[PDB]
Amino acid sequence: ELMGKLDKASKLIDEENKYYARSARINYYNLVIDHAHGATLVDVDGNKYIDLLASASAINVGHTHEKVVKAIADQAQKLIHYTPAYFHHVPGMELSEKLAKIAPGNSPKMVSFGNSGSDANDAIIKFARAYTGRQYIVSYMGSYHGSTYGSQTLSGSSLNMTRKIGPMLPSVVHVPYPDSYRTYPGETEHDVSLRYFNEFKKPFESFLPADETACVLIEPIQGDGGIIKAPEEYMQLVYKFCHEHGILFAIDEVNQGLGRTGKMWAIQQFKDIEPDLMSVGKSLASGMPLSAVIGKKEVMQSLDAPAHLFTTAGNPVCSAASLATLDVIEYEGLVEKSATDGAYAKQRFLEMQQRHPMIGDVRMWGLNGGIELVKDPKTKEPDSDAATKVIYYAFAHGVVIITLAGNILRFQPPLVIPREQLDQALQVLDDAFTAVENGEVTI
Amino acid sequence: HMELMGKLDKASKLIDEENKYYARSARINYYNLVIDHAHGATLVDVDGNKYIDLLASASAINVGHTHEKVVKAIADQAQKLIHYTPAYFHHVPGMELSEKLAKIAPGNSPKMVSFGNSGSDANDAIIKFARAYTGRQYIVSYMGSYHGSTYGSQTLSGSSLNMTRKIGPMLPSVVHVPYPDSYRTYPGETEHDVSLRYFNEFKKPFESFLPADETACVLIEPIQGDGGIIKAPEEYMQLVYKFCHEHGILFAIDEVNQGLGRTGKMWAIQQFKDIEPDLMSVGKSLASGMPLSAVIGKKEVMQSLDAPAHLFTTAGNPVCSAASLATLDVIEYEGLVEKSATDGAYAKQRFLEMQQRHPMIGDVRMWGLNGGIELVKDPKTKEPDSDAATKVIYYAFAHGVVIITLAGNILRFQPPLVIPREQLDQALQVLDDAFTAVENGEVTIP
Amino acid sequence: EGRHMELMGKLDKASKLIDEENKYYARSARINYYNLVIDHAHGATLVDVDGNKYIDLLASASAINVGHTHEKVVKAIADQAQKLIHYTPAYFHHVPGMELSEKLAKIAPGNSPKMVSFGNSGSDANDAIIKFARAYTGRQYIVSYMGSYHGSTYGSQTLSGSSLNMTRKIGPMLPSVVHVPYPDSYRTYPGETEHDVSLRYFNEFKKPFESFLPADETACVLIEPIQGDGGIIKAPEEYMQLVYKFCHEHGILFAIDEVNQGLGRTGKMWAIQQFKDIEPDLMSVGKSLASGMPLSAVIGKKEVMQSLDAPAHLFTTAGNPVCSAASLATLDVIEYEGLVEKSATDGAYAKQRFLEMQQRHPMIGDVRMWGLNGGIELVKDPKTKEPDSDAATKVIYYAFAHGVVIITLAGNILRFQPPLVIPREQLDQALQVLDDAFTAVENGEVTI
Amino acid sequence: ELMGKLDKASKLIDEENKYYARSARINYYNLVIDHAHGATLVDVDGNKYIDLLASASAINVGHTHEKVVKAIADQAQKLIHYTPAYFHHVPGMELSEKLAKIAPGNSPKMVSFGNSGSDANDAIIKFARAYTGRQYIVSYMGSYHGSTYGSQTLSGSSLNMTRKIGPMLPSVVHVPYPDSYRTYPGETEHDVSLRYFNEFKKPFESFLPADETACVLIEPIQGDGGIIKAPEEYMQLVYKFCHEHGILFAIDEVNQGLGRTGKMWAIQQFKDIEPDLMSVGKSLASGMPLSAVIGKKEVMQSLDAPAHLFTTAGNPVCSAASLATLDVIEYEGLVEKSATDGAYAKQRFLEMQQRHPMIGDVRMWGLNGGIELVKDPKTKEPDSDAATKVIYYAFAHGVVIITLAGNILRFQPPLVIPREQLDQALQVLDDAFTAVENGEVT
Ligand SMILES: *Cc1c(COP(=O)(O)O)cnc(C)c1O
Ligand SMILES: *Cc1c(COP(=O)(O)O)cnc(C)c1O
Ligand SMILES: *Cc1c(COP(=O)(O)O)cnc(C)c1O
Ligand SMILES: *Cc1c(COP(=O)(O)O)cnc(C)c1O
């Protein structure tokens, strides 16, 4: 009877499925969105929903923000596109300057635009190789960096990102990302840091010369990996190791940047780290396609054209949408709001944890959380069946939420989400856990 | 100098600042053009100078700048939904578009679509799908090709050494073959001789180290864009197509530059007889310069992967999809395919007549409103004359006409397909004047 | 100083010969320890061009399991050479190569039908394991280990993990290779048991498969059942069984490198026989196979060895008939002299001797021994386990100056691999020299 | 009858085929060799043959040469092996010094030993990369460089060297080797050279930066490709190109060195070319496993240990066999004999070609030839069926010969082959051409 409510959607999707490749979408629900605003979504059948996904953190300023809508409309009347690969336009020039300056740290930076976070990570590999003269790249297990052949190789969060499409880009080595939940009994944060740093070093102590490694790319908090934040001390060791060996230290801020964590950049959750290179995307232009690689000037001067460029990257309408997006973040104080509401949301989920033992771990840094569900607190066996039931319930009760790794609830609403609506959604999740416990949810 | 800094005062100041912040590898520089607004084939810079656009942002503006139908599609969609990722959910403009692209692609076999943001990423998808469907690893692409700037597409490319230097190793198991050149040919060669010679070169890796039975795909621009506006001969293309079918290698085309009416047919591959690709990449003009791309392939090939093998968060953005639907409406309603064909025939005649008076013009190549005017120091040696081409385009810019080069010495002719005959004639006279000026030593580049 | 001059006086012809060779022979082709120029040798005794003799505790890196210039091997070589020095098996056939390929198929571990292909080197047999694994499974990925040594051809060198100088300056290396950590039972976390070590290392093994590396696209795991160059480090039984079962569950071929540890070095014929009921899909053999004449083999289950057509894997001089004759002789010697049992017996005795040394010499942090095959790991402190390469270099230098040839692994580990024939009297003389060396180093008597 | 004469060999082979991988041999005949000497082979059934293959040019000094036999036996009694990867021995030291000096050109060289020509070509890749700091390698279609992952990637002579075993080594590019037989109507050698040099430049003009190319590896004459020699002018153009762009120029002398061509090194067939790197093998130790990479000293200093070394490489027995092999070449004048006997053989095969038009091209440099058989002299269509019948006939008449590329007879006897035996084998091949002409062979 939920299917009675999704009649136009179901019929649209059945036809879409005949034309649109199945590898292009991770399927959860029959949700065909007609319009949206803020944290509210409306489907083609008229159902309304609170967005706790923000399109995978691409909608930090909320849907259809009036400043961004106007920026897009106004720019499109003047110039829809001229490629910055050849020429110049004012929105692109203002934005590239602004990005260089608001990027973390005070060393002089330069920028190159792309369309996607994926291509910004391809760029990280190019610039690191060119600047250093070295070929090897280190990235993490559990990472997500995108879907172009460079970024895809770096990634480690899906087997379907490797199957059937190899050989991948050569000279990439994956190391394990610090997991602070499934630890050895008794380990402190210090023990975890040292153990993962020990694993980090083992390739460098065997087959991988540190002196031929161009860069380490790391998510300061892993997004698709499950909302997992590296310990402070682990990050400082990696940082120092890179500096000591002449390896560039690169970050991926595509998911966790632009105020998601309650600082501007996820890397600001750590003390005094300035990356050599960083990728930005997702929220940058409120979901219009735009990305950037930002790096220390000298690194960004290591390539000649046309080593890294795209016809529609730095599109003027996208750039205008991004200038408006950044202004909203600043004017509406969304970095601070993320920190405030994240602290609140954490406390709420931790209280839910006391009553709902299926909740193994609550990870939250700003309005940005992973709620991990396990069958048992000692074995920490993932309970994906429970998580699916929770999200299916939420969906049927007007709350859009998805999972990471099968058993982790992904919590990334628009940073603008009104308290009232955040509380409504949180109550719906409480109800969902209760309902699942009483076996009342049927897939 | 006083005169150019007079016309370009504000542009030069803005560019000097931009250069402190924007990486040099991100732009191929020709001239101090900062565009404020534009419409149809008219560009206006921030100083108020007006230009006729003979580049269409590298054939991304087939429908002309700020086409009202597209601008309205963008504003109206933006008010409803700027974005929700089709990597998780669904929206109507994207569903309408994906079905439409599946149907308008060349040939009658059932197709499916996957969106990206760039022609680059659609070429990476071609590798991924061809490898998954065939279970083979090797990819064959062309010298002189341009497929993009992601690690897959950039490996397949062959038009700039700066696309390989300092950044390898590149994607493994890619082999480059030479693209047929019908200008610098051996004495006495016919088109048949050229086709057979290039085909013989195509075969040599397959007769040596490259197993045809382990080759997933051959990727070809039916006409090379960045390579110089070079069209493969009919017979050569038929030979490769047949070779692919006989060995179970997917035959893939890149229509990112040459598609959507550029050549005077909807797809450049329709310049050849009865060829239906297994896979094809689309981009550039698809959404009037808004970032959108697609990989389109035979159904059974597109079913060979599971999620999330190929997807991007902002690909199939609803605003871009709305723009593309509007763009495809314009092409049809305004008969732009036919207009490119008629104006193409006309432009080729005008440039052939210019070649009679201006022997620096070695070769006039044109298929639709889509030409390469190749300049040379001597008609018999055919030695490239890049200095002359640079002077021509600099003269042109100073006289209100935006045009750039391919390979140093080839004038690139790709106006918006909507270009009014009156502006096309103005721009052609400017070029004619340009050739005269360079001939008389009246152009000196600072 | 006076002493150094004295030593160098006994090496006068050798030093002069080496100085000239250094003008023509590339530095990357040798890891230098001593001015040792061998004139002749027999058994475990080496004789240099200056007339000094030495007890061999290296056996040319376990290539001389049957001892030097074994009469039977010399005779095989000489008699074969008279008949046919070479005809390549890449085209034609000869009886010594036919006899030997059949014998190797049969003496390989396990009772599944096998086939063989010859190489010249342990390196090229490991390239072959990549080739055959990829071809049989239709999968591209190869998993090997940190700390491994598999050779110096581009495939085998990529799989390796024991020297940075095997990657520096020569990449890109062979693609689709992933390296995993090998179980270290010495430097462990406080209070870990062998069971804890086995689970922790297997957990690490699984991480790539749980991340970026599809098990269903992994052609093979290649493992040394005991790592040689990595330090004489044996995988725990439980770890090995986990990896073996994982491979079979996912259709990944399980391959072993026996080039160093095979042919009776561990006191079983094959080092994988140190484990319960494990039969490899593929294995590489080398080193001692032909008493140091260049020969190798890849040995695999029949259906794996049938996955390729000619000439996917062949070398003009592999399966040379003089090398083959040497190898048939060498295998006879192993059998007829009972060297597998002698390795085990002498290995047990040497282990006790080194354990008793360790009671008196706390610089000995770990004594690892499986057969006449040991790593004696020297450390600055028993609790920190910090490596003491300086102490180790001093020990082997003292040994060399006192008639015993022994080298190190990883800087700080004494490599103990004498020819398996070594007479007890000699084995005992060598052991006393090492005991003496420890004492000398403790008392500051050795200067490098 | 033919199978009657090979009773024991056939049963032996059936048995060996159960145990020895099929990928390890290219099968031609049921030939199981018992003993051999000079250019004479004797099988296990007692049949004798004249060797026109020399084990793929590994037996330049003839089988079981007394000097090599004695060197092997004398050295085995002293020391069978001690690895030069750690220590030293005199035969190895004398040989590395000697090879450094007899290699082509006057610049100071250094040497590193391997076991196989394959491993020496892997080393060319290593050293070129390490010395130049560049990654790309250029090699040729039609080439054969070996069966290790490096050398096998460089190779271009067999599809079964690529199938099923990829990905291969990355950053390798293949270019077409000049074909002087199947040319465009009217082409001169100058035209051939310039056209092939044009194709050589195409990758460097498109995707492959000459400034990131570490080396070009070339067979001065391609062996397995069909006995095909690059024109002089083409080689000079490549050589100059390499020097102008800082690319190492490397040669593979594994098949064509050690006197095979009638000069010591095949590259000496060209004017004043000194390679930066070169691979040596095959005949080096009379078929005992030994190889070398020889390069200009500064190139060979670019790597540290243990970047390239093998346990059994530079084995002292193989080393002694090599020293003796090199002495034979000098003391029996085998470089000149290959030149003189090669001129003689070329004239005989050219005279055969006048009477046997199935003979499309006669290529010969030294005692080293490719006799290419075609269905028609104008079309040049390959006739692998005629070549198969020729070599089968030969085998049945006491002459061992094989093919390259299906239709090219491979003519590489030991350089010592006595004139009586060379005339006898030439007449057998002339009879074979007749038999095949008359439809007498199946
Ligand atoms: C989403 C994401 C990307 C990829 O961005 P796309 O725009 O989908 O190409 C890269 N990195 C991280 C951490 C991400 O979450
Ligand atoms: C422009 C172009 C591409 C790449 O498109 P981007 O949108 O710049 O990634 C691909 N192929 C051809 C033929 C092109 O001209
Ligand atoms: C020595 C060794 C090899 C290499 O053998 P070479 O003959 O030197 O190529 C391979 N594997 C292991 C375990 C070794 O010890
Ligand atoms: C035979 C050959 C090789 C390989 O030598 P192996 O000893 O078989 O590895 C290399 N190059 C050439 C030109 C050859 O003829």
Side-chain angles (χ1 to χ4, degrees), chain C residues 17-18 21-31 33-34 36-41 46 49 56 58-61 64 68-69 73-74 77-78 81-95 98 101-102 105-106 115-118 120-121 123 127 130-132 134-135 140 149 152-155 157 163 165-166 169-176 229 287 291-294 305-317 320 322-323 405 407 415, chain D residues 12-13 15-26 28-29 31-36 41 44 51 53-56 59 63-64 68-69 72-73 76-90 93 96-97 100-101 110-113 115-116 118 122 125-127 129-130 135 144 147-150 152 158 160-161 164-171 282 286-289 300-301 303-312 315 317-318 400 402 410:
Chain C
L17 292 169
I18 298 166
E21 179 192 18
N22 284 334
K23 291 182 183 167
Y24 306 104
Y25 196 67
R27 78 159 183 282
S28 56
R30 181 177 294 105
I31 301 161
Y33 286 95
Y34 317 124
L36 180 54
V37 186
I38 304 157
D39 180 74
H40 58 280
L46 314 176
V49 299
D56 188 10
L58 175 57
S60 185
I64 313 299
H68 293 279
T69 61
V73 184
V74 172
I77 291 170
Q82 202 82 243
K83 304 175 60 162
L84 184 68
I85 289 167
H86 191 53
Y87 217 108
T88 182
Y91 296 116
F92 309 125
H93 310 260
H94 58 69
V95 173
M98 296 165 111
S101 59
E102 173 172 344
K106 293 175 173 181
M115 300 184 79
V116 168
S117 176
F118 286 125
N120 304 107
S121 68
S123 296
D127 284 25
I130 301 167
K131 295 174 189 184
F132 282 106
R134 285 180 172 177
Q140 79 179 71
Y149 189 89
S152 216
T153 46
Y154 264 98
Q157 189 147 345
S163 176
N165 288 347
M166 290 171 71
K169 306 199 128 133
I170 67 159
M173 302 298 297
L174 189 73
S176 302
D229 296 73
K287 285 194 171 96
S291 280
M293 298 303 293
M305 305 301 286
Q306 291 178 318
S307 61
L308 284 174
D309 299 334
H313 192 261
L314 53 70
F315 305 94
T316 308
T317 70
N320 164 297
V322 172
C323 304
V405 171
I407 63 162
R415 184 170 186 158
Chain D
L12 295 171
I13 291 160
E15 179 66 12
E16 179 193 12
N17 283 345
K18 299 174 198 176
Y19 304 109
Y20 196 63
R22 79 162 181 291
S23 59
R25 175 182 297 110
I26 299 170
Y28 282 91
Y29 320 120
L31 178 63
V32 185
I33 298 151
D34 187 71
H35 60 276
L41 316 173
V44 300
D51 188 9
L53 176 54
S55 184
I59 323 297
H63 289 273
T64 63
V68 183
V69 176
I72 284 156
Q77 291 189 297
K78 293 176 83 177
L79 178 67
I80 291 169
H81 193 57
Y82 215 108
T83 185
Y86 293 121
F87 309 122
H88 317 258
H89 57 72
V90 180
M93 295 166 108
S96 59
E97 175 171 352
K101 297 173 167 173
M110 294 190 86
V111 170
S112 174
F113 280 128
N115 303 110
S116 65
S118 296
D122 278 22
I125 301 168
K126 296 175 190 182
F127 282 102
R129 283 181 174 176
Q135 83 178 76
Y144 185 87
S147 217
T148 47
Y149 264 101
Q152 191 153 342
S158 177
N160 288 347
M161 290 170 70
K164 306 212 123 94
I165 64 153
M168 308 295 294
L169 190 69
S171 302
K282 277 195 172 95
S286 292
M288 299 301 299
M300 303 305 282
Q301 287 171 321
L303 282 176
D304 293 327
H308 188 258
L309 53 73
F310 301 91
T311 307
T312 66
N315 168 289
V317 177
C318 297
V400 172
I402 64 166
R410 184 182 185 147

Side-chain angles (χ1 to χ4, degrees), chain A residues 16 19 51 88 301 304, chain B residues 18 24 84 90 113 128 306:
Chain A
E16 186 189 9
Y19 303 105
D51 183 21
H88 319 250
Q301 296 171 316
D304 288 346
Chain B
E18 183 190 17
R24 83 165 170 288
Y84 218 108
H90 312 260
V113 170
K128 292 179 186 176
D306 285 348

